[PDB]
Design a protein around this motif. Structure first.
Motif: not given
Ligand code: IL7
Ligand code: CL
Length: 290
Positions: A232-235, A252-256, A258-268
């Motif tokens: 399990p992956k959480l990005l 990465l969301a498409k290719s990894l 068992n992965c959930k990608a989570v948008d955190i908003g503004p970030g560097l």
């Protein structure tokens, strides 16, 4: 966003050196191991851990030469960190783990996971190290400085003599302005220039344009493993990002698996400093699915 660090210090002897770590939460169950990068410490997890510690053991070491850990006379190559982190995990008797990893901590975590996949029950990651085959694929805003960092003359003058990785690179890895208290926490391990070797060797270990070849090969290997692994992956990702821009997070969301990608908003880069509430809350929810 909290500036305090209210965690009891714990130390363990590792390869003849003392390593500081946070250790909170229950004693039984699968522990959650938080691995920081450059130029941070377990301080970067201070507002994430409190979402997880009510129900899971949280372990957050300071890498050797960083934070409150001892500062031996080393070159502080990635291989040095691998040896100490391997021994740290063994010294604590960890069996299975959940990893929460960032920057050079993600290189350590992914490299350990690739070598010990049966013991990794999940990986949450953000702004992580992947092979950068050319300088053209390194973010433009960071190209001139990181090219200068990767020399033995100007790069050492900037990072070691002038402490530019702490006074410059760190704050520009956070969208919001870091406060004086927060900066003082990050500055504390590096007040003496003679202790700044990890801050310079780390950027010289980044796998960019084929150098250093040993790191390029190891990072390519753990990225191939990750692309094939059912773990399990959480990005977590943000905009504009640094190492993982929105376009790369999408790929990465498409290719990894068992992965959930989570948008955190503004970030560097230091996503933990811009949205700890969401990162901690989402990890806490995700752990129940493992
Ligand atoms: C795994 C490790 C990867 C971590 C990702 C990097 O995170 C930072 C995000 O990328 C930052 C892009 N920044 C740069 O390329 C850069 C520009 C300028 C300077 C720099 C600064 C910056 C800020 C600052 N306070 C507001 C002060 C400086 Si100073 C000390 C005047 C400086 C002097 C020189 N000669 C060069 C550059 C700077 C930096 C450090 C980075
Ligand atoms: Cl770095």
């Amino acid at each position: 966003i909290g500036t305090g660090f209210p965690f009891d210090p714990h130390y363990v002897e590792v390869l003849g050196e003392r390593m500081h770590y946070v250790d909170v939460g229950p004693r039984d169950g699968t522990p959650v191991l938080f691995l920081h990068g450059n130029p941070t410490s377990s301080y970067v997890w201070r507002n994430i851990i409190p979402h997880v510690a009510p129900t899971h053991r949280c372990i957050a070491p300071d890498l050797i030469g960083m934070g409150k850990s001892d500062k031996p006379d080393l070159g502080y190559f990635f291989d040095d960190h691998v040896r100490f982190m391997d021994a740290f995990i063994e010294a604590l008797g960890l069996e299975e783990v959940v990893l929460v990893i960032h920057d050079w901590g993600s290189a350590l975590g992914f490299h350990w996971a690739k070598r010990n996949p049966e013991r990794v029950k999940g990986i949450a990651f953000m702004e992580f190290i992947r092979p950068i085959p050319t300088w053209d694929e390194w973010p433009e805003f960071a190209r001139e400085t990181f090219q200068a960092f990767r020399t033995t003359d100007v790069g050492r003058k900037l990072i070691i003599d002038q402490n530019v990785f702490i006074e410059g690179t760190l704050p520009m890895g956070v969208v919001r302005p870091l406060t004086e208290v927060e900066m003082d926490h990050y500055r504390e391990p590096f007040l003496n220039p003679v202790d700044r070797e990890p801050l310079w060797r780390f950027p010289n270990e980044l796998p960019i344009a084929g150098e250093p070849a040993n790191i390029v090969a190891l990072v390519e290997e753990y990225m191939d493993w990750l692309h094939q692994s059912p773990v399990p992956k959480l990005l977590f990702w943000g905009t504009p990002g640094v190492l993982i821009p929105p376009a790369e997070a999408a790929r990465l969301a498409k290719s990894l698996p068992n992965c959930k990608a989570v948008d955190i908003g503004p970030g560097l880069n230091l996503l933990q400093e811009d949205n700890p509430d969401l990162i901690g809350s989402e990890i806490a929810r995700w752990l129940s699915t493992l």
